[PDB]
Design an enzyme around this catalytic site. Sequence first.
Site, PDB file in Angstrom:
ATOM      1  CB  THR A  34      43.655  45.503  35.804  1.00 46.11           C
ATOM      2  OG1 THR A  34      42.178  45.431  35.289  1.00 46.11           O
ATOM      3  CG2 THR A  34      43.780  43.503  35.361  1.00 46.11           C
ATOM      4  CB  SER A  35      46.874  49.246  36.794  1.00 43.41           C
ATOM      5  OG  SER A  35      46.978  50.006  37.177  1.00 43.41           O
ATOM      6  CG  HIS A  93      38.849  47.272  39.695  1.00 41.43           C
ATOM      7  ND1 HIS A  93      38.571  47.218  38.096  1.00 41.43           N
ATOM      8  CD2 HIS A  93      39.625  47.309  39.443  1.00 41.43           C
ATOM      9  CE1 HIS A  93      39.351  46.905  37.646  1.00 41.43           C
ATOM     10  NE2 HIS A  93      40.283  47.199  38.819  1.00 41.43           N
ATOM     11  N   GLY A  94      33.797  47.605  40.893  1.00 42.88           N
ATOM     12  CA  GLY A  94      33.262  47.684  41.045  1.00 42.88           C
ATOM     13  C   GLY A  94      31.711  45.977  40.021  1.00 42.88           C
ATOM     14  CB  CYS A 135      31.943  47.399  36.789  1.00 40.49           C
ATOM     15  SG  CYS A 135      33.178  47.501  35.147  1.00 40.49           S
TER      16      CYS A 135
END
Lengths: 249, 4
Positions: A34-35, A93-94, A135
Site C-alpha cells: 500500500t501507499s 515497508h519492511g 516494520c
Amino acid sequence: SGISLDNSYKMDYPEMGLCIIINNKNFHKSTGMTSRSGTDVDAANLRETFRNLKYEVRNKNDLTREEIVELMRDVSKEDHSKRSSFVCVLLSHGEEGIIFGTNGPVDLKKITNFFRGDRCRSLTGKPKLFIIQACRGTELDCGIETGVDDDMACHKIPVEADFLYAYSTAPGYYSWRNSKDGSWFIQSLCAMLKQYADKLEFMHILTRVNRKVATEFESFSFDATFHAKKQIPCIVSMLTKELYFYHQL
Amino acid sequence: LETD
C-alpha cells in the site's frame, strides 16, 4: 599541549557528511504493497532537521530494489575524507532485517555492508548512522497502564564498528505512521534533534525519542486487533565514542 | 493511522 582525551568522535571536518534519505511512498502494483501516506511529511521534516545540523541532504523518492543497491554502492565509493560522518534514512515497508524497494525487498545487511570499515575506507573510524522507519514484524504491543589476544603490533578495528542503527520499533513489531503527521518515530526524532542537538550526546537524544514515542502515542482503530497499541523504538549501537553534532569553535 |  595539555592532557588530551579521545572519548568523542571528531566532528569538525570541513563537512558534516551526507544525509541520504530514501523515501518510498508508491509501490509497484504487483507487490501488493500500500501507499505510505504521510511519508512525505517525514521526508520533509528530516530534510529540514539535518539541514540545520549542516548535513548535505540528498532525497531519493520511490527507488526499486536495484536502484537502492546501486545508490548505496555509488555513495560508498565517493571520497568521504573531508566528511565527519555518514547518515542514511530509510522510509519504507519492511520486515525483520529487510527494507522494501518499490518492486521488492532488500536485505538491510546488503546496504550497510557497503560502508563496512574495510569497504569504505574514507569512513573508517567515523560514525555511520542508519535511521530506519519500517516494520520489523507483525507483533503488536498492547501496552500497560502506568597475552596472545592483547597488545597487537598492528592495530585493527572491527569492520562492524562505528555503526548506529536507530530503529523505529522493537524487533518483531509493527511500526506506526499517521497519514497526516508522519510516522511516530520520525516525528519524535526530528523534534528531539531540533531541541537537543546543540545540548546532548546522540544516545541521550535517542533516549528522549524512545520516551516520547513510548508515552505520547497510542493507536486508534475501528479494528479491535489494531486498536490501543503502543510502540517503543530500538537503539542499536556499535559506536565506540560519544557523538555530539556540535564542536568547539 | 497505518502500519509499515
